[PDB]
A = this chain, B = another copy of it.
Amino acid sequence: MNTVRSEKDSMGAIDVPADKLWGAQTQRSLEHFRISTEKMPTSLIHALALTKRAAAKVNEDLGLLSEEKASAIRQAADEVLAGQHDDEFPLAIWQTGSGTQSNMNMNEVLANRASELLGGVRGMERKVHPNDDVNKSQSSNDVFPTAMHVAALLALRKQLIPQLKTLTQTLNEKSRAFADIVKIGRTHLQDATPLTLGQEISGWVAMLEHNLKHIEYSLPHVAELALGGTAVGTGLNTHPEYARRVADELAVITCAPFVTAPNKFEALATCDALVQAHGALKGLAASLMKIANDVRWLASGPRCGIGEISIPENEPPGKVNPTQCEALTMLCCQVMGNDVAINMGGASGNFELNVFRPMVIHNFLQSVRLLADGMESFNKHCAVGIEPNRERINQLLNESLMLVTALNTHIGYDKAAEIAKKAHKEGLTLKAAALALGYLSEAEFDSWVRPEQMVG
């Protein structure tokens, strides 16, 4: 739309698009921070709306906000949460370091929309006011960190942890299914003593179980909310019950165990909870990288690699590219880079406020999307369909030199070592070398060399 509406703040008037619900401060941010393409993610917009909805409820409870205004603000916020206003949040990640401008974006959109819901209009004649009403009892300095932790905790609980559990269950099923398939071990990339395919997969399972525990340990700190610390952490200009009440209300409307931060100075001056929680996520990325690499190397072929397993072929001779493994290894690199950006932002607070916050939460929520969706994708498009190539597994095992120790108790170490050395030097199987030396019969070799007895 070309037509404009004049919106005002303490700096003066500025034109906004007539068909939009934001106000003067959103427009100034939009115009002054035309930096790349990264915007607040929907999860964070929703967390800001939840924060305003909770603040409106508590302000009404405390007699600070009229029922009529509080109810209209909560209705406007519910419209945002229902996906009706995604285009009303146009601001960049690369804005003021406190997130003030996105706080004001929510204040302006909710105020203009709440005014409409009370039979009023958007703009200067509005019935509901962004600062006096929607931002009542609040500062950008405690709202934006609150929205960061609300978005982060809900994403971990509702997306990442469920997908981690699902992938773990699938691989546990595979470990059980393949518990009796003996295969060659590999250490240093070299043929090594055998283990079962189920044992190898049980390592992946145990990795994902350990990662879940580490991620769970990080959740209580992310559950601490800054809301109520206002500008510098003292809670100046708040009711003494407000901080506990608004954390309780957020816990009610999200069904997550939010609590008010016991030290609001730590809560405002740092992103420490997110630095620590992302430490657990980069641990998961290192684990998933290893699992994804094992899968694609074991599936490599079809004839000039390892080829011990097959994976589902999802996108169009015999060349099956392990594309889910590639997407997953790529996003694991991304999580490692994101951790460095977060660490720099988290290390860079000054005095009463950390002002690297849009960048920190942009990276953090991206890592959660990547790991959650990446595990979901890898599970349904790869892991559920992993199958052994039993003939190839057996070919590699039986043509290796690593079953030779099964001969020791029968013919002695010295003759067994002689057989292995002859096989290696002359390019023979262990059986052919042993027969050539006359040290055993073929029936004895087949009776004695039992891989299923060599895996514990």
Contacts and interface: CB of A to CB of B under 8 A. Distances in A.
B344 A333 contact: yes
29 contacts: A25-B316, A35-B370, A35-B374, A38-B366, A93-B330, A96-B326, A97-B330, A185-B232, A186-B305, A188-B323, A189-B350, A190-B300, A193-B234, A195-B265, A202-B263, A202-B265, A206-B262, A210-B221, A210-B266, A214-B279, A234-B456, A276-B283, A279-B280, A283-B346, A290-B349, A317-B401, A317-B425, A326-B355, A332-B347
A222 B331 CA distance: 24
Given A276-B283, A333-B344, A377-B33, A191 B305 contact: yes
Contacts of A193: 231-232, 234, 236
Interface string A1-20: 00000000111000000000
Nearest to A297: B189
Interface string A283-320: 10111011001101100111111100000001111111
Contacts of A354: 290
A44 to B, nearest CB: 12
Contacts of A41: 37
Interface string A401-423: 11010000000000001001100
Contacts of A85: none
B404 A206 contact: no
A358 interface: yes
Interface string A202-226: 1101110011011001100100000
A263 B10 CA distance: 43
A269 B282 contact: no
A94 interface: yes
A424 interface: yes
B11 A322 contact: no
Interface residues of A, number: 155
A114 to B, nearest CB: 21
A188 B317 contact: no
Interface stretch (A47-55, A67-75, A335-343): A335-343
A355 B300 CA distance: 14
Contacts of A366: 36, 38
B269 A290 contact: yes
A432 to B, nearest CB: 13
A334 interface: yes
A146 interface: no
A226 to B, nearest CB: 12
Given A275-B283, A330-B359, A95 B323 contact: yes
Contacts of A305: 186, 189-191, 306
A235 interface: yes
Given A37-B41, A279-B282, 19 more contacts: A9-B316, A35-B327, A96-B323, A187-B232, A187-B321, A188-B296, A190-B321, A191-B303, A195-B352, A211-B276, A304-B397, A331-B359, A333-B356, A333-B359, A336-B344, A337-B338, A337-B339, A337-B342, A338-B341
Given A35-B377, A270-B207, A301-B191, A100 B286 contact: no
A363 B337 contact: yes
Contacts of A339: 337, 339, 343
